[PDB]
């Protein structure tokens, strides 16, 4: 956020351009930069595009969904946000997105596969194509966002493709490409917290045992802003994670009390809060819905990843290398699960869980 995201009013890109900034940093100001955010209509793109457009950075947002892009225009002043209809199977549209940008941010990536795109097409084929198209267009900075457990030799088809995608981005764009490895991100409408906030979660006895180091999505969006506007971060890999380690079983049980579903001794068990299932059934059901359901459900690869915990690459850089302190999930967990609290609505008295109260609740959850 801040009031002006730059250390100076003059910035010479590594491509040779000199970009001046005007204004004090409001909506009417400009930074002189043109950025392209691939995957801007997604969960993280809306955070990133909003932070760039609010300070006057011209953002090119290539879209495939016409309805999802409309809310992005509100973030910036007139002419700041620009849309290009595109497809990763179309090369002319990809070049048009990066033709004028000085920064290219790649947020395109899926944990699923569909009738049209496999995990290899998106996490590798798209990332490689975008990196090469960026280089031929003279883009000074490339930022590629992989996952937290990226590994070219992983048993998970998502972790493997994310790890290989890191390699191909550097092999095309060159050694100066920056790589970000966010942990599971929590925010409003967060894919990480949405599965924990769902009631009828089938096979949670297997799925919810994975441990992670969740990180605030606003900080990940803030960190990417720091990286793009500081050329000392080129060629670097950043592992953005929170200080504390949680298992999805803990958060699932901590959320239950905040939602007050446990007010009744019978209701959570009757409503389907716990849905134990043998892993072969979880495999078959995930496999079956992969060719019957039209919406991306819990697939086979996510079942495998439920066993693999998050491993922090120690050779990579952290939030402290960017001069930022990670946020604590304890200080943000309530306000992001607040919409899901059942009665609330100033009935008698709200139970606002402070940061101290969340940690007290965590011990009670872990007490048998």
């Amino acid at each position: 956020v801040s009031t002006f995201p730059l250390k100076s009013d003059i910035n010479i890109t590594k491509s040779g351009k000199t970009l001046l900034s005007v204004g004090q940093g409001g909506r009417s100001s400009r930074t002189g930069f043109t950025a392209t955010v691939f995957g801007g209509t997604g969960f993280l793109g809306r955070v990133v595009v909003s932070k760039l457009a609010k300070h006057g950075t011209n953002v090119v947002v290539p879209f495939r969904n016409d309805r999802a892009r409309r809310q992005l225009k509100v973030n910036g002043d007139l002419g700041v946000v620009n849309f290009v209809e595109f497809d990763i199977r179309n090369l002319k549209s990809i070049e048009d997105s990066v033709k004028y940008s000085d920064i290219v941010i790649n947020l395109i990536g899926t944990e699923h596969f569909s009738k049209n795109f496999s995990i290899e097409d998106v996490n590798i084929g798209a990332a490689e194509r975008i990196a090469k198209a960026a280089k031929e267009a003279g883009v000074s900075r490339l930022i590629h966002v992989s996952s937290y457990n990226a590994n070219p030799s992983s048993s998970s088809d998502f972790y493997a493709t994310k790890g290989i995608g890191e390699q191909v981005v550097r092999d095309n764009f060159g050694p100066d490409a920056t790589i970000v490895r966010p942990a599971p991100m929590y925010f409003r409408n967060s894919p990480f917290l949405n599965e924990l906030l769902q009631i009828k979660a089938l096979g949670g006895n297997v799925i919810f045992k994975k441990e992670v180091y969740p990180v605030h999505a606003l900080q990940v969006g803030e960190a990417i802003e720091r990286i793009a506007f500081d050329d000392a971060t080129a060629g670097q890999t950043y592992e953005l994670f929170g200080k504390e380690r949680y298992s999805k079983k803990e958060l699932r049980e901590m959320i239950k009390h905040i939602i007050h579903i446990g007010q009744r001794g019978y209701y959570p068990y009757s409503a389907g809060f716990y849905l134990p299932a043998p892993e072969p059934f979880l495999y078959a059901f995930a496999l079956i819905r992969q060719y019957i359901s039209s919406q991306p459900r819990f697939n086979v690869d996510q079942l495998k990843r439920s066993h693999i915990n998050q491993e922090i690459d120690q050779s990579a850089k952290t939030f402290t290398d960017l001069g930022m302190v990670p946020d604590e999930l304890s200080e943000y967990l309530y306000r992001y699960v607040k919409p899901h609290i059942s009665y609330t609505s100033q009935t008698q008295n709200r139970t606002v869980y402070s940061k101290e109260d969340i940690e007290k609740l965590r011990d009670y959850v872990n007490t048998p």
């Binding site: 009828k200 019978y266 068990y269 009757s270 409503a271 389907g272």
Partner: protein
């Protein structure tokens, strides 16, 4: 006649809101229907136990009375 129209509406909404409570209630309902249909006799034997312990005339008690009269009457002729 209104339960015939409402029953599909109530049953599906009951499973949506409380799938475990509905499955347990519906599962027990089907089990007793299998007891009656397939002549498992579980509900009948419980009924025969309740009558015996509470002093009612059971089915066996009424048949024993007939057998006592039958033996009494035959000797009265022989």
């Amino acid at each position: 006649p209104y339960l015939v129209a409402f029953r599909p509406a109530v049953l599906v909404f009951f499973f949506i809101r409380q799938p475990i409570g509905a499955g347990l209630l519906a599962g027990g309902f089907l089990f007793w229907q299998a007891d009656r249909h397939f002549n498992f006799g579980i509900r009948d034997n419980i009924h025969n136990f309740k009558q015996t312990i509470l002093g009612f005339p059971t089915q066996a008690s009424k048949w024993e009375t007939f057998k006592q009269v039958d033996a009494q009457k035959r000797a009265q002729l022989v």
